[PDB]
Structure 1
Amino acid sequence: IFCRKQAGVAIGRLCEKCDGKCVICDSYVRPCTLVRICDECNYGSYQGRCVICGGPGVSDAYYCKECTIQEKDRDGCPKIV
């Protein structure tokens, strides 16, 4: 399930369990570009969380270079809410 309400300028973050993988491609490598999320899945208790685990925002969700070659990173906040 996806948020997909369109993108913004607020970076996303990763818990430490979820540390390292891309958001969709589920890679572990060659991350190129930073993730951005929507205000609605940006506010409040959802500030600085794990887009996947829900855990605390510590490490930065990133985008596997394949995902940027196919521009699957131009859709917005992909938060599994």
Structure 2
Amino acid sequence: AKHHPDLIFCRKQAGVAIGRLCEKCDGKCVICDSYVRPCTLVRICDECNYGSYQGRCVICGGPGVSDAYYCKECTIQEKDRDGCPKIVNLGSSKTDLFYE
């Protein structure tokens, strides 16, 4: 996300598995986290979509509900043509809140 600056994306080669977003994350652009003008579907790589990891939220890791999307300002800047936008690590937020 852009709010949490320590989160890193997968950025490997994007396959054919369409990325999904959870119920808490619905409407968000993957890169921006803005809610308006979705234009392009999210294709996550094959390691980020394997077995138990299928149908899972791109940002969270929770159970996916809807399809994921890039906004139009990610489409026209071509931020959808870098890699798999699956946020890999869970770092320094929603972990100490679990510990609180």
CA shift digits 1:14-41 (9 cap, x unpaired): 1000111100111100101100010010
The structural deviation recorded for 1:55 is 1.1
State TM-score, norm by structure 2: 0.78
- Which runs of structure 2 are paired with 1:47-66 in the superposition (5 Å)? 47-66=54-73
Superposed displacement of residue 76, structure 1: 2.2
Indicate the residue corresponding to 1:69 in structure 2. 76
Unaligned runs of 5+ in 2: 1-7, 89-100
Deviation per residue, 1:19-74 (Å, 9 max, x gap): 11100111100101100010010101110100111111211110100000000000
Q: Larger Cα Rg: Structure 1 or Structure 2?
A: 2
Structure of higher RCO (CA pairs closer than 8 Å, 6+ residues apart): 1
Aligned length: 81
- Extract structure 1 runs of 4+ deviating beyond 4 A: none
In 2, Cα distance between the equivalents of 1:7 and 1:25? Answer: 19
**Percent identity of the aligned residues?**
100
* C-alpha contact (below 8 Å) 1:8/1:76 kept by paired residues: no
Query: Partners in 2 of 1:48 and 1:62 — Cα distance?
Result: 14
Distance, in Å, in 2 between the alignment partners of 1:57 and 1:17 is: 9
* Alpha-carbon contact 1:12-1:48 (below 8 Å) kept: yes
